[PDB]
């Protein structure tokens, strides 16, 4: 069974990068390919866009 690189999850994203108005958050995971299957070029971190309400 030719699989993708062995990569953990995505674990849960944090709180955004702002308090309030436009604004994005980010959340990053690890390799976990101890068996030496290669090495790929995919993607440990990801970013998404959160706007939070008006500023209190």
């Given at each position: 069974g030719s699989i993708p690189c062995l990569l953990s999850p995505w674990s849960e994203w944090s709180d955004c990068?702002?308090?309030?108005?436009k604004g994005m958050r980010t959340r990053q995971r690890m390799l976990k390919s101890l068996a030496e299957l290669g090495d790929c070029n995919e993607d440990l971190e990801q970013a998404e866009k959160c706007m939070l309400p008006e500023c209190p």
């Open positions: 990068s702002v308090t309030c108005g």
